[PDB]
Amino acid sequence: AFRVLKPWWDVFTDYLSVAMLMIGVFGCTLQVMQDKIICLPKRVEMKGLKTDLDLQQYSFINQMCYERALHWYAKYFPYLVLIHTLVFMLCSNFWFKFPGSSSKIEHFISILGKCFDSPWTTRALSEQAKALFEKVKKFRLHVEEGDILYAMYVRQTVLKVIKFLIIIAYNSALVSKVQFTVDCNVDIQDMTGYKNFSCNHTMAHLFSKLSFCYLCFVSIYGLTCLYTLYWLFYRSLREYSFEYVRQETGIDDIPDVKNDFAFMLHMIDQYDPLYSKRFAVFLSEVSENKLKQLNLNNEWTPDKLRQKLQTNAHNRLELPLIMLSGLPDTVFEITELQSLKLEIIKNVMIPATIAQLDNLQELCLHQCSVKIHSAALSFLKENLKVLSVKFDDMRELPPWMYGLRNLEELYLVGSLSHKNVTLESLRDLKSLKILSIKSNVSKIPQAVVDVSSHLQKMCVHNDGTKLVMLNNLKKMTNLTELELVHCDLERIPHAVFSLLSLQELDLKENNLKSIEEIVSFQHLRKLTVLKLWYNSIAYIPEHIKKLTSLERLFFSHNKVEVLPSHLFLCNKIRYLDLSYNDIRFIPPEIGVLQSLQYFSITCNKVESLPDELYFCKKLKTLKIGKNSLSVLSPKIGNLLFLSYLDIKGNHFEVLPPELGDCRALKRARLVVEDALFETLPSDVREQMKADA
Amino acid sequence: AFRVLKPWWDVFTDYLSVAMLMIGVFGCTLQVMQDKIICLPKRVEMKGLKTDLDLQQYSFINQMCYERALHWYAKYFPYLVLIHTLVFMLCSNFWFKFPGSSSKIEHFISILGKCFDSPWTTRALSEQAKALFEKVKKFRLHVEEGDILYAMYVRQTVLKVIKFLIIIAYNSALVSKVQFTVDCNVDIQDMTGYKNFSCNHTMAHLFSKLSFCYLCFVSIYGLTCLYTLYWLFYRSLREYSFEYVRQETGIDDIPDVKNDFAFMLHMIDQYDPLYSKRFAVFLSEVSENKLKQLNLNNEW
Amino acid sequence: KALFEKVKKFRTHVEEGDIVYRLYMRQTIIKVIKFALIICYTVYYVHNIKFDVDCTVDIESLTGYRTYRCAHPLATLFKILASFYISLVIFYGLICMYTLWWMLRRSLKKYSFESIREESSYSDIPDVKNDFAFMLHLIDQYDPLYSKRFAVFLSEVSENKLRQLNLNNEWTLDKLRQRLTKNAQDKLELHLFMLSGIPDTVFDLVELEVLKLELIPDVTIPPSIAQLTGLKELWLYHTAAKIEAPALAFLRENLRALHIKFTDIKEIPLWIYSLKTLEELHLTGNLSAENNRYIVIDGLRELKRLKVLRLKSNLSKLPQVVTDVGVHLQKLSINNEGTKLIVLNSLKKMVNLTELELIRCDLERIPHSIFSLHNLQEIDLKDNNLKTIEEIISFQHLHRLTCLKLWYNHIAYIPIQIGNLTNLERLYLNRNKIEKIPTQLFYCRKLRYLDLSHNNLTFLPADIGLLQNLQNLAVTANRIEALPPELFQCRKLRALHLGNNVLQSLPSRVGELTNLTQIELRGNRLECLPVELGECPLLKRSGLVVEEDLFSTLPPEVKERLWRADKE
C-alpha cells in the first residue's frame, strides 16, 4: 500500500529528496542566523585607519549594501532550494494523494496482497479463494479500462525531469556569479560622507560548496530520472505478455492485459518478480476450473446422487444431471447406474474413473461438449451399448462417439444438413443395430451404409424436410424395422421396395394422398406393420388385400371418406386404427376380423355399428370416440375379453346392462358419461368399480 | 473517521493552511529575532559624518521612530497571518469538533465501514449483518432527520471564502505600504537635538516577497473554496438518486435519501464512488429479503 | 504440510540466486575501502587544525596593515573531535576487516549441514547451495540452534512422517468398514490400491479375510497385523514391501493363501519361504530369467504345506523347484498366456496332483506325462490350439477322471474313444468347429454339464436320452434347427443355454422338462413358444432368455404366472 509501489529508483529519489529538503532548511536557518554583510568604505609603521563613524552608521550601510550589492539569487538560494524540493515532494506524493485514482491503487494493492496471501494459488501451481476469484474478475473488468494512472505517472516523471534540467542548466551559470567579497557604490555619501564600500558576507564560499554538492545531487537525481524514462521508452509497458506461466503451468489462459494492468504488472515485477506469478493465478481460467471442480466435489454428496437416481425411458438406472459445471467424482462412485443423463453441461472431461462405472450401458447427453480420456474412451468403447445425444450447433458433438464398436443404440437430436448430411463415417459402430436421428437431413448419408451390413433399425424423423435421394435406402439389406416421419415425401419410395426384410414400416406426417403402390408392398411379404399416419389419404386400393402379412394397421388422421370391403380381406391384421377420419358407416365385413384385438374410430362420424363388428370376440380394445352413435346393443355382453372401451362424446340415452358381462372391462377401462354409466344397474356399476 | 471526510480540495486546503501557518511562524520568528529599525539624522575629500550621539540615544531613536513611523500593519503582518491561519484551522476542525454533529458523523463512519466490511454485500452484488440491518434502518431513522450538518458545513465554507476575500482585499492595499526606507520627524530635538531621521529595517523587502507568496497562496485557497462552493450550488446535493444500483443490480428498492444522507453520499462519491455502491447494498430491500431468505433456509 | 510446501517453493526460488551474497560482499568491500581512505586522509590533514594562525591578506587601502595573528578557539576542541572520530574509524575498520576476512575464510556458498544430520541421524538434510548457505551461516552466527530448527523441515524423512500422520488422521474405521467387501469366495476384502502407506487403524478390523494390495509403495508391515485374525488369503500387486519379525511370526501360522502380482523379480520379498502355513500361492508376471530361471523361486521346497499353485509367467520350461515341491501339491495351474511349454516329462512326478490347468500354453498336443497323474480328476487346456484329440484313449488310465476341458481350440471332430471315458461327468469344448455329435459320446452316461456353444453343430442325436445325468448344456452360436423328442426324455434337466440358433420351432414336449429352471432362446428363429413351456414348475422370467415378441405368443395366463413368480 505504501511500500510495494516503490522501485529502487523511487527509493533513491526519495532519499535524494529528503537530503535536498535538509539542505534547503539548513540553508534557510543559516541565512536567518549568521548571514550578515560587513561593510567598510573602500576609497581613501602602519596605524589605524579610522573613518570616525559609529556602529549605527555601520549597520545602516550594511543594510543598504546588502539590499543593493548582494546578488538576488545568492540571497534567495535557500528559499529557492526549499521551494523546488517542496514541489518535488508534492508532485511525488500527488500520485497517491489523488483520491480518484488512489482508490484504484488501493484496491489493486488489496487484491494483489490477498491473492498472493491465498494458499490455493500455491496449491494449484503444483475455500474462499473461489469467492475471491469473483473480485479478481470484477477488478479485471473495471480497472483494465483505466490507464490514466500510467499517463499520470508519465506526466509526473516528465515534470521531474524538466525541473532537474532547468535547475542544472541555470544554477550552473549562477553559481559563479556569487563571490565571498562584494563592492557597492551607492549614494550613501552626503548621508554618511562615503559612497564606495567594500563588503562581504561570511556564508558565501560555504554556500558555494554546499550548492556544488546539491547540484551534483540533482545531477544524480536526473541520471536516475533518465534511467527510469529510458526503461519507460524502451519496453512499451502498454502490454504485459507472460509467455512463461502458460509454458510452465501449461495453462493457456491469462492471455494478456490492457494498458493499466500491464503498467501495474511491470511495476510489480520491478518491485518483485514473484508476486506477479502469485497474483496471476486468480486470473487463470483453468485454475478457476480446478477450484470450481474441487469446491463442487467437496460440496457434492453421493447420497444426493442416490436419491436423484431413477430409471431412464428404456428401463435403466439413470442419474440425470440438469445443471453442472463438471463431473463430480462421487458420480464415479455410483457403479450401479445403468444410464447416465447430462443436460446442458459444457466443458465435460471424463477421466479414467469411468472404469468405476462398470455396469453402464446407456448414456444420455443433452447439449454437452463431452471429451474423454483414451482410457475412458476405451471403457466406453467396450461397455457403452446405448447412447443418447442432443446437440444444437454441432459444436457439442464428440468425434469419439463414432468409434464405439460395442454400441448398439444411438439417439440424436440436432440438425446435420444445416444439401448433404454432415455425418462422420459409421464404420467403427460394429454393433450398431438401432439408429434414431432427429435432424433436418436432406439426403440420406453414406455413413449409415457403412453400418447397414449389421444395422437392424434406422430411423430419421425430420422436422418437415423433403428427403431427396432414395438411392442409399435401397442398400439397407439388414434393415428390419424402418420408420420415416414428416419426410415430406408425398409419394411411396422405390427404396423400401428394395428392402424386403422390412417388418415394420412407418410413413407418419408424409402427407400421402394417392397410396396405390401397395402392389410394390406385396414385394415385401414380411410387411407385418405399415403406418400411414398424418397423411392426406382418402383412397384404398384393392391390392392392399395382397399383403396377408399385414398384422397392424394405422389410418388415423386421414381424409378417408368411405372404407372399402376389400380392405377386410387381410384377415391377419390384428390392430385397426381408423380414428380421426371421415368414416360414418362400418361395413359388416368387419365380422371376419376375428383376431382383431384393437379397433379405434375416435372422432369420426360413426353413426351405427353392424353386429358383425361384435363378432370380433378377441377385441380387447374398442375406442369409438366422440362419434354420432345413439344406442348400444346388448350383444356387447359377449365380449368377455374386452379390456378397454371408449364411447365418450356420443348421443347414447341408456347403456345396456350387458356391458357388465365384459369381465376384463372396468370403470377405468370404460370411458362413458356420468348419465351413461348411471344407466347401468347398481350391481353392474359396483362390479365395474369394485368387488361389491 | 479522520481520513475519508476529506475530498481532494479539502486536502489541498489543508496543505495550504499548513503552509500559511508555517510561513506566519517563520515571519513571527524573524520579527522576534532580527526585525530592527536603524535611524540616523537626515538633514545635513569626503570624510565621516559624526553626529555626537551615544548608543542609548541610538536605541531610543530607533524605538521612537519604529513605534511612530512604521506601519502598524507592517508590524502585525506576521501576527495577522498567524491569526488568520489559526482561524482557518479552527473552523476546519470545528466541523468535527462540535459533539452534537460529531456523534452523527462518527456513527455514519462506523456504520459505513461495518456495512462495506460485510462480504454479503459482495454476495448480493454478484451472517450477523442481517441483525446489522436493524442498525442500518435505525440509522436511516436517525440521521435523515438532520441536515443541520449540511447547514454547518455551508456556513463554514461561506466563512472561509469571506476570510479569503477580506484578506485579499485589504492585504492588496497594504502590501504597497511597506518600504525598505522610511523617514520620521519627532520632537527628539531638545531631547537629542535632532528631529529629522532617515530609517530602515532589514526585513522590509524579504517580508514584501513573503507577502507576495502569501497572497498567491491565498489566491489558490480562494480558487479552491470557489470551486467547492460552486459545486455545492450546482448539483443540488439535497437529494441523491443512485439510478445505478437500481439499473445495474435490477433492484427497484432504495427510493431516495434525505438532505443529510444525500449530502453524505455526495461527499463519499467525491472521495470514492465505489464505497457508496458497497454501502447501498444494505439499503436495498431486495437484498435484505434475499439475506433473510438465506438465513431462513439455513435455520429451518 | 503447507510449511513443507513453502519450504520446497523457497528452496526452488532462492537456492539458485546467489544475489544477496554478492551485494553484501560489495557493501563490505565499499565499507573497508572507505574506512581506509578516510583513516588515511584525515590523519594526513589532522595537523592543519591549529589554535593560532598567521594571515597576510594584504588589505591596506582599508586598514593599512599587512600581517595578522589570529586565534581559533575550537581548534584544540576540533583536534579532540578529530582524534575521537578517527579512533571510531579505526574501530569500524577493524570490525569490517574482521567481517571480510571471516567471510573469505568461511566459503559459505554451501552449508556443510552434515554435523546436525550426523548427530540426529536425519540423513535427508542435503547441503544447500549459495543464497541459502550464506543466510544459514549468518543465522548460525546469531544462533546455531535456529539452523537445526530449520534442518528438520528440510528432512525428507520428517516430511514423509508428517504425511503418514495425515494419512492416519484422514482414515476412519467406518470408511474401511464400508470399504470392506465380499469376494466370490465369501471372504471380507479390503483391497488397498494406490495408497501411499499403511494406516494402522486397518489392523483393528480382525474380520478382514482377504487383503489385496496394488501399487502401494514399499511399505513395511508393523507388528499390529497380529490383530488381523481372519486374514487367510493375501494379494500383493507390484509392491516390494518389507516386514517385521512379529508380523512374520504371525503370518507364519495365520496365513493360508498368498497371491503376488509383480512386474519385477525384486518385488517378491525373500521372507516368503519362512511362511510355513502357506497352502495356495498365486504368482503373476514374467519371472523368466536367463541362466538363472526358476532359481529365484527355489525356496518353494521350504513351503511344505503348499498345495495350490497358480502361474502366469509366460514360461517355456517347467521349473525344477516347482517340480520338486509338486510332491505335496494337489493342484497346479500354469498360464503361459501364449508361450509354448515343454513338460520335459517333469509333470508326472506330482502324482498327488488332482487338478491341472494349462490355459493359453500353446501346447498343440498332449504330452504323455499328463496321463501319469493317477489322482488327476479335472483338466482344462484352453487355447492350446488343439486340432486332434484322439489321445483321450489313454485317459482310461485315470480312474477318477471326473471332468475335462479342451475348449477354445481347433477341435472339429470328436474321437469315438471318449466312449471309453465313462467316468466323465462334465465336458466343455466350446469355441471350436464341431459339426456332429457321435453316438459314442453318449456312452459317458455320468455326464452332467456340457457347453458346446460356438460350433458348427446342426442337430442333436436321439441318444441324448442315454445321458440322463445331464443337467446343463449350451449350444449357442450353432446351426441347430431341430430338437429331438429324446431331448425331453431327461426329466431332471435343470437349466439350458440354447439361444442364438436357427431353431425354427420348439417341440411341445418341453413340458416334460419338469426340472427346467433356466432356458436361453434369444436369437433362435422361433415363431411361437410352446404352451407346455409355461407349465414347467421352475420356469422364471430370469430363467427365460428369449425375445419379447416371440414370448408374446405364449398364453396370457402363462405370462401372468411368470410375472407373479418373478415378483415372488
Coordinates of C-alpha atoms in Angstrom, one line a residue, chain A residues 28-29 31-33 36 43-44 51-57 59-60 63-64 66-67 76 79 82-83 86 90 93-94 97-100 103-104 106-107 131 134-135 138 189-195, chain B residues 6-8 11-12 15 22 26 30 33-34 36-42 44 46-51 53 55 58-59 62 122 126 180-181 198-202 205-206 209 270-273 275 278:
Chain A
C28 CA 17.4 28.9 5.4
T29 CA 18.4 28.5 9.1
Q31 CA 20.6 32.7 6.3
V32 CA 18.4 33.6 9.2
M33 CA 21.0 33.4 11.9
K36 CA 25.3 39.2 7.6
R43 CA 38.3 54.7 -1.3
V44 CA 40.8 56.5 0.9
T51 CA 36.7 56.9 9.4
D52 CA 35.1 58.5 12.5
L53 CA 31.8 56.7 12.2
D54 CA 29.6 55.0 14.8
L55 CA 28.1 51.5 14.9
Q56 CA 24.6 52.5 13.8
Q57 CA 26.1 54.1 10.7
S59 CA 24.6 48.9 10.4
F60 CA 22.7 51.3 8.1
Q63 CA 21.6 47.1 5.3
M64 CA 21.8 49.2 2.2
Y66 CA 23.1 44.0 1.5
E67 CA 20.0 45.1 -0.3
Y76 CA 17.2 33.5 -2.3
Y79 CA 14.3 29.6 -0.3
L82 CA 13.3 24.7 -0.4
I83 CA 10.6 25.7 -2.9
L86 CA 8.6 21.2 -1.8
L90 CA 4.3 17.4 -3.6
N93 CA 3.1 12.3 -3.3
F94 CA 0.3 13.6 -5.5
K97 CA -2.8 11.8 -2.7
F98 CA -5.1 11.9 -5.8
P99 CA -8.2 10.1 -4.4
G100 CA -9.9 9.3 -7.7
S103 CA -8.9 4.4 -4.8
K104 CA -8.0 2.1 -7.7
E106 CA -5.5 0.9 -3.0
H107 CA -7.9 -1.7 -4.5
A131 CA -15.2 -16.3 -3.8
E134 CA -15.1 -13.2 -8.2
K135 CA -13.4 -10.0 -7.1
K138 CA -14.5 -7.7 -11.2
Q189 CA 27.8 59.9 0.5
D190 CA 26.2 63.2 1.6
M191 CA 24.3 60.9 4.0
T192 CA 27.4 59.4 5.6
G193 CA 30.2 61.1 3.5
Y194 CA 31.2 57.9 1.7
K195 CA 30.0 56.3 -1.5
Chain B
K6 CA -11.6 15.0 3.1
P7 CA -12.1 15.4 -0.7
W8 CA -9.2 16.3 -2.9
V11 CA -6.6 18.0 1.4
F12 CA -5.4 20.9 -0.8
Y15 CA -1.8 21.8 2.8
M22 CA 4.4 27.8 8.8
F26 CA 8.6 32.0 10.2
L30 CA 12.1 36.7 12.1
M33 CA 14.9 37.8 16.4
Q34 CA 16.1 40.3 13.8
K36 CA 15.0 46.2 13.9
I37 CA 14.8 49.8 12.6
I38 CA 18.0 51.8 12.2
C39 CA 17.7 55.6 12.3
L40 CA 20.1 58.4 11.5
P41 CA 19.7 62.2 11.3
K42 CA 18.5 63.1 7.8
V44 CA 22.9 67.7 6.8
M46 CA 34.6 63.2 1.9
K47 CA 35.0 62.1 5.5
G48 CA 32.9 60.8 8.4
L49 CA 29.6 62.4 9.4
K50 CA 29.7 62.1 13.2
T51 CA 26.6 63.5 15.0
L53 CA 25.2 60.8 19.7
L55 CA 24.3 54.2 21.9
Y58 CA 20.7 55.4 19.1
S59 CA 18.4 52.8 20.7
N62 CA 15.2 53.5 16.9
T122 CA -20.4 -8.7 -2.5
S126 CA -22.6 -10.8 -7.5
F180 CA 12.8 49.4 2.8
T181 CA 13.4 53.1 3.7
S198 CA 16.1 58.6 7.9
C199 CA 15.4 55.0 8.9
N200 CA 15.2 51.5 7.5
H201 CA 14.5 47.9 8.7
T202 CA 16.2 44.9 7.2
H205 CA 11.9 43.6 1.1
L206 CA 12.1 40.0 2.3
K209 CA 8.3 38.9 -1.2
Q270 CA -16.4 12.6 -4.3
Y271 CA -14.0 10.6 -2.2
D272 CA -14.9 7.3 -4.0
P273 CA -18.0 6.2 -5.9
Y275 CA -17.7 2.8 -1.3
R278 CA -20.9 -1.1 -1.5

